[PDB]
Write a protein that binds this ligand. Structure first.
Ligand SMILES: [Cl-]
Ligand SMILES: [Cl-]
Ligand SMILES: [Cl-]
Ligand SMILES: [Cl-]
Lengths: 985, 985
């Protein structure tokens, strides 16, 4: 009877049908576009010889002339557009070639003239210029992220405002935690992040709507947007010679200011020869305080709040605020205010509206019926919709400025908070910005701050796109992820706390902060993370104001050692070891940092270990899908049981916790790295005995890993101890009998090899074997996948079936974070392996994987790979090659680390270890580095081909003096030092 | 500095300013409209002498001519429009009167011509006719509810489809539980219930959009909607002489049909003299299976599903379905299909689109750029947006029909479910509706079913609006609430289970169902509710497939006795007492219904009692705000502790559970009523000894209530036992020291009096005293409020400080359910009190309260009271008088019961007790009643003034024979009996 055909089961594509029908008749070129003309997929209509893949037929069908002309042929007849000479022809399946009329030819040429830049382009500074009339390659492609600046104030990690702005100005604005200033929309589409009325405005002339900022109509002749670092600029040109500019950014915090403030400046210039009397209506929607009640009870959200008006000391209306009855929703107060600067005179809105139904009327949001006549009625219910209207006359050649301040004041930064505090802070903010030039000065301050922040490491390679992407975009993303973790984004709209392992972000940004005089901020972050470690050694999984989920995951506390090692090595500041930080257990208890690190190592190395001595897997580790044990316990219950066992067995503290739980090998690698880091810290702190115990413990752990985790072709991922019959003993190598692919003998994890190399456990032969294995199995045309297919139901029957189609997330996708860690391991191995061929192959693999994650390269084939040309995405779909969000992940952090490492810079106790690994085709690499008391200018020259310090003669000069030691000293003479490296044939 | 003025603090209204500026100059009439011209509220513009309150100035400002004319006076001057001699003038504050121009006069006369019908009107059948161009009085005013018909199938209460449709066809469509067929929107506004594209379509001619069903533009000359019982009809007329009709309803279930199916028929008639070639694009959005992930992870919702196409046996495309990868989301399969009927020719959609971005393009949803050229591309991701396009030619004077079937198949009605089951069921449904007249036959079947269902009680007064509201609208609402409880609505969008006390709905609908041959359905509902009672006597608070929250609330199980008593009294079917129903404890255990009722009575009367012997309050009772005890326990904990106490103290089953918890007096009234009901059931079942024990227990309970609950003016609400010092001992009468109002001595609860009268506990003197107290304190101009202000923090210092402004919900609002119970108590008292003046006063109060809840009376002042002219709302705002939803509540059930009781019909062991209570101004009341084997025609005549059988001589005739007994026998002779009552002065 009725049959069903799915999207993935439809094998034939329109382009394939077009190639079949017209391949031997016309030259299809390298790229072409096509569309099915009917629901039976029998006939196609397309255009040939495109410069790149693009939805050209979708744009063509929107043209009335072209669609009307095509109606003579389609459906029931396949046609193709072909350009010959300077004219366009239509070709049918019978070989007939017909010259199109003049209007059709003109429309076709105008459409296909600029296909190469349909998705935009990047300037020399890495800013993305977007045409507002073009289709979006993906939901994250045209997204910009804005952040505040709470440096030097309390609770910087928890109180920094955040915002997401798209190409049209749409998006949302959030204060501390998940508090909303502008409304966030939770709907079916990924493109709808906020309420559609946010940040939009209307322009009226003579009572007729002449402009809407979120709708490009026939009266707009030019409309472009520019995404830059922490600011967005949108430009419009109208047919009546009006030039409109919108600049959106976030105000850096000053004393007496509200906690969150977003500034939008609208400049309207009259390029005509006649004065024009216009009016502006700026609209928006406040975010509700009862987010759960949106899904629970919308009427509750509506009836608990009302609208209120704000007046200055002269009694003039200035803006609207939402007023809440319940006390819990009175701890934050929102506001929106408008100032109209006409030449030297200042004015304030003359009308307002607070009801969506009255404002829209019988029209739509794009053409509201009551937009030009605001009723000045204060709504007694929610939601907090607002529309402020003001008239103004602009003279020929003159400009009128409109400054809108949206924001929120909170009790999180004030004592005895009330609405009076909000009024005082709003008065301070308005007095600060009473002059026109103050907004420009603040914008310049933001730009200069980010430019100076990015100065720690500067690339100079001639490739402007790469230099801009690293020096500006990547540095900003690292700062943003340091301040925000993974809590906000275009599609990250729920409430999320800061994860412990997200300390990984501080692995990259700290060197930047220390280089702008904010070493104390890095110390504060380190102590804040240390405060979430319990006395035994486990840590809270998440924390925003307080910690939660104690010891839920077994790998969390082991990441802190890497951050402490990085900070102490870079700064040589061991005094942080003596700092007394509160313990996560509580009850006014404090411990020295050194003792906390010792407790972490002891917990992961002696107490929470399995039969083979490797750390217990517990519920899971870094890999969230490794739910091998269904009877796992957290830190608190494990501690209680451990104390019970100690009292029963009459043992001593530090003994093994008896159990039959599984062991994590990646946890063992992390523990070994942490032990080595603590040994280095102790020997830097003149703690000889502690260094000795750390060294012997590291040797013992390495012996255990080599004895019990190496399975003759790979390092295992999990060791299983609960099957006494021997049915299953390990997972993550050959012979584990858990592979779900008949053609693959065993399961293989990328992280196993990555952290075997990173922890300096694997040997050269093991490195070569694992590299061969990952080349055979884990390498895909779109990168390196996290893991080969596995059948975990045999050992854990409680695991459910899959949730994703092939190529998505857990079903064979390429996760860029894990791939970046693997690339770091490959670089580290290639820097020191004896075999030159193995090093060359590993460097080639690393560069191949790096080329797939650089955001700017997303603009080469934007409509196939999607992603974002300035911000890193999460993973790559192995079925289509498309980059899919969210935009916040460890990809940016580990990519920055990998690029710096490939430049050859490493930090050790003796100073700067230099060991660059350049591309085979590269012949020159120049960059500049900053140190707290010096600067370095590195230049490297080499011939075409692979070259490295390990197996190639070279000349190294520091300050013009030839040197043999590759460790550059960390100078403190406040002088610039020139370093030159030359590779010979 | 900056000051803030809230909506409630702005005392001066525009109408007050208009009255103070023009009151002594022109005649403003009884009603007027006004609007502030500026944000300083200094000047006003308005229109005088309106027939009723309406937003006339909002509509006037939308007129370009009127707005342009007004722009020459406002905002600097205050103006008023006045009609004098069919000519409009404008009046200024200086006394100047100016005749408006001709166009302004024409627009003004056209606008205010039909102000009285701006919110619509009701037909003789109670159907609401709505103009699509007029403002909505409230978010629930233009809402219609549609329900399916699963009678005679399995799990009717859990599998009946439901739908909400507004005046434009917007809304949503749901299946079993909260399963969505069409997408539900969770946003800030109450008006947005579903996705905007649901049930909407576009009409194109020559590639240009000529019609959109959700937007009224200048090309539409007529646009009206009609809300009827279980169907919605919308009509449009275009300037090009096109007549469009949409009919939306739900298909009653048949064997082999899908579980949920919504049918929309679109008829397009060409009233011109030329044949027209048009095309239709019907759009919509499927509901997602991962509702929580919408707020959690929108990308997850997008990537777990794809689009698929459906083809018939001939290989022709017929529709779109969403295909899910995860197993848990594969248990339901959605579908949308289209059929085009051109005379006898049948055709299917020729194109489709499944991407929102491609469909909308550079336009909007109202004017999509790719609407006329669907790309026929199956989306690989979500959401399930669909748009089906088909062309057709309509001849002059001819009609083209388009039938769209949306729906869902589920595993809840099938075994070994897969998509093949959905395909087979869809094939069955399409085969059933292959003829054009099948849709009309199904619609007529629905109409006839509801007409026949409403025939149990038929009023035959002269109002013709009250008759329609009761006979059709109220009966349908009672049926809808019986099937749906309080789970769905315009603003009720979350997932809700069936509450136990919602058995109250069956109090009213059962007599209807029994009278259409569905007594077995009522028995099934009774047994389903009985299955949720535990062995001890408590019950689950909620249940959809299984019960949950055992014994959480102390009043739940006591409501079942009333339902059983009603059923047994009406049907005389005591065999239900012998039925073996599973107990809620489980483990294959069954108990007779009689034993379950006995256990309920024993639990509420002997075990779960306090110091005074009244039932324990536990967490709460019917009143959810009575959280007096913060250490309350549920049924399971209480049972475990009771067994521990019994074993410790060597007691026996049936002894009191020792504690110091509070006691609920309303629970005591419910228990007394249940005991009386069980006594009546026992004596009807020839169970003499059980009747004797029930009688003595009822006497003991009455003695306890009279001794311990009556405090010198009122019946207390809660008895407090945890203060040995005597600081607080009771709440809900005079002297409880818990009043929050200094002018009120004590707190007073309406339900206390209501259920004292309803349980036949209060005496005549107590009734008079409580009536006086209610008139003094609990009576407001907008009805009877639930409770006087109270300060519960003195005994329960853990509750919040309040969530609502004055007049909303818990803060002094009039809850219509509690008011209806109080009205029932007033009617019952007035039917039997000795004092004629007291009975007259109580009847007057009851009728005054009833006049405030009748939905049709909402059309008298629609723009002030709002509500819904056909469906009851929840409560009335005591600050403004506005009716606020949701539309589902016990108001409808108790209003139906109250109206039937006021008609004088009661059911007792001897038959029909007759005791009408008519309005003072009424002089004639005729109605018809149905009994399972007979029919009655009641006529009552009386002079002007209060009259009742208690204190007035009368003549009663049955079948022409004068009788003295007022109990009409329940005849079973299948004949109509005439009953006549005459009241004489
Ligand atoms: Cl994101
Ligand atoms: Cl892993
Ligand atoms: Cl509702
Ligand atoms: Cl109550």
């Amino acid at each position: 009877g009725i049959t069903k055909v799915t999207a993935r089961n439809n094998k034939i594509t329109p382009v394939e049908l077009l190639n079949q029908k017209f391949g031997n008749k016309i030259n299809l070129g390298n790229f072409a576009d096509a569309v099915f003309t009917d629901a039976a997929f029998k006939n196609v209509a397309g255009i040939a010889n495109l410069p790149m893949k693009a939805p050209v037929m979708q744009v063509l069908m929107e043209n009335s002339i072209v669609s009307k002309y095509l109606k003579q042929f389609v459906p029931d007849r396949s046609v193709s557009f072909v350009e010959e000479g300077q004219k366009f022809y239509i070709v049918l399946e019978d070989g007939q070639k017909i010259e199109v009329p003049e209007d059709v030819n003109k429309a076709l040429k105008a459409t296909v003239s600029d296909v190469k830049h349909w998705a935009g382009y990047l300037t020399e500074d890495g800013e993305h210029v977007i045409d507002l009339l073009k289709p979006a390659p993906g939901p994250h492609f045209y997204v910009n992220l804005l952040i505040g600046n709470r440096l030097g104030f309390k609770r910087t990690l928890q109180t920094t405002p955040k915002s997401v702005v798209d190409r049209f100005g749409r998006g949302s604005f959030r204060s501390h935690a998940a508090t909303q200033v502008l409304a966030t929309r939770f709907d079916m589409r990924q493109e709808e992040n906020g309420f559609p009325a946010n940040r939009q405005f209307y322009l009226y002339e003579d009572g007729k709507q002449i402009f809407y900022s979120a709708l490009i109509d026939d009266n707009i002749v030019e409309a472009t947007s520019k995404h830059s670092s922490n600011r967005t600029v949108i430009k419009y040109k109208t047919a009546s010679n009006l030039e409109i500019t919108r600049t959106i950014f976030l105000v850096p915090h000053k004393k007496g200011f509200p906690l969150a403030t977003e500034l939008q400046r609208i400049e309207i210039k009259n390029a005509s020869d006649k004065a024009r009397n216009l009016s502006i209506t700026y609209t928006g929607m406040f975010g509700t305080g009862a987010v759960h009640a949106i899904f629970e009870d919308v009427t509750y959200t509506n009836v608990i709040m009302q609208s209120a008006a704000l007046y200055n000391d002269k009694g003039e209306f200035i803006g609207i605020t939402p007023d809440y009855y319940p006390e819990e929703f009175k701890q934050d107060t929102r506001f929106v205010t408008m100032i109209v600067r006409n030449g030297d005179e200042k004015s304030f809105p003359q009308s307002f509206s607070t009801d969506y139904n009255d404002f829209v009327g019988t029209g739509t949001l794009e053409h509201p019926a009551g937009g030009s006549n605001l009723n000045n009625k204060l709504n007694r219910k929610g939601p907090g919709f607002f529309a402020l209207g003001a008239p103004f006359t602009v003279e020929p050649g003159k400009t009128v400025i409109i400054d809108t301040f949206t924001g929120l004041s909170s009790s999180k930064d004030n004592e005895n908070y009330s609405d009076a505090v909000m009024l005082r802070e709003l008065d301070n903010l308005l007095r600060y910005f009473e002059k026109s030039e103050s907004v420009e000065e603040t914008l310049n301050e933001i730009i200069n701050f980010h430019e100076n922040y990015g100065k720690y490491f500067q690339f100079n390679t001639g490739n402007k796109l790469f230099d801009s992407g690293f020096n500006r975009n990547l540095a900003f993303q690292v700062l943003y992820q340091t301040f925000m973790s993974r809590s906000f984004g275009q599609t990250q709209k729920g409430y999320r706390e800061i994860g412990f392992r997200e300390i990984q972000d501080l692995f990259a940004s700290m060197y930047y902060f220390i280089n702008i005089g904010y070493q104390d901020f890095v110390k504060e972050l380190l102590f804040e993370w240390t405060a979430n470690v319990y006395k035994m050694g486990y840590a809270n999984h998440n924390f925003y104001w307080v910690g939660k989920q104690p010891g839920l995951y077994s790998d969390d506390s082991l990441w802190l050692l890497q951050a402490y090692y990085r900070y102490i090595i870079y700064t040589k500041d061991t005094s942080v070891l003596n700092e007394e930080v509160p313990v996560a257990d509580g009850n006014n208890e404090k411990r020295a940092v050194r003792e906390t690190l010792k407790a972490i190592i002891q917990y992961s190395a002696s107490i929470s270990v399995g039969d083979h001595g490797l750390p217990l897997l517990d519920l899971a580790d870094w890999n969230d899908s490794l739910k091998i044990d269904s009877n796992s316990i957290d830190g608190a219950t494990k501690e209680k049981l451990y104390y019970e066992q100690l009292k029963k067995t009459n043992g001593k503290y530090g003994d093994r916790f008896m159990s039959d739980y599984s062991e994590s090998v990646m946890n063992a690698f992390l523990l070994k790295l942490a032990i080595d880091h603590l040994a280095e810290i102790a020997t830097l702190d003149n703690d000889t005995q502690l260094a000795q115990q750390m060294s012997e413990l590291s040797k013992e752990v390495t012996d255990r890993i080599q004895k019990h985790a190496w399975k003759e072709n790979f390092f295992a991922r999990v060791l299983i101890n609960r099957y006494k019959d021997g049915s299953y003993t390990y997972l993550g190598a050959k012979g584990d009998k858990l592979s779900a692919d008949p053609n693959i003998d065993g399961v293989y994890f990328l992280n196993s090899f990555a952290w075997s190399v990173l922890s300096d456990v694997a040997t050269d032969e093991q490195i070569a074997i694992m590299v061969d294995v990952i080349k055979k199995h884990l390498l895909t045309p779109y990168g390196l996948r996290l893991v080969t297919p596995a059948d975990l139901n045999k050992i854990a029957n409680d695991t459910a079936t899959g949730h994703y189609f092939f190529g998505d997330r857990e079903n064979g996708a390429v996760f860029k974070h894990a791939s970046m860690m693997a690339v770091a391991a490959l670089i580290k191995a290639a820097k020191k392996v004896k075999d030159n061929e193995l090093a060359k192959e590993m460097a080639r693999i690393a560069y191949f994987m790096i080329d797939l994650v650089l955001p700017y390269k997303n603009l080469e084939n934007p409509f196939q790979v999607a992603g974002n040309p300035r911000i890193s995405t999460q993973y790559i779909n192995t079925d289509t090659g498309e980059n899919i969000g969210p935009l916040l992940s460890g990809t940016a952090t580990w990519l920055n680390l990998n690029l710096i490492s490939l430049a050859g810079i490493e930090y050790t106790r003796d100073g700067i270890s230099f060991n660059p690994i350049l591309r085979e085709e590269e012949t020159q690499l120049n960059f500049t580095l900053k140190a707290p008391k010096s600067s370095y200018k590195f230049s490297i020259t080499k011939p075409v081909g692979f070259a490295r310090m390990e197996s190639s003669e070279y000349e190294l000069f520091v300050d013009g003096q030839k040197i043999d030691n590759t460790v550059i000293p960390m100078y403190t003479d406040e002088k610039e030092h020139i370093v030159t490296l030359k590779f010979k044939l």
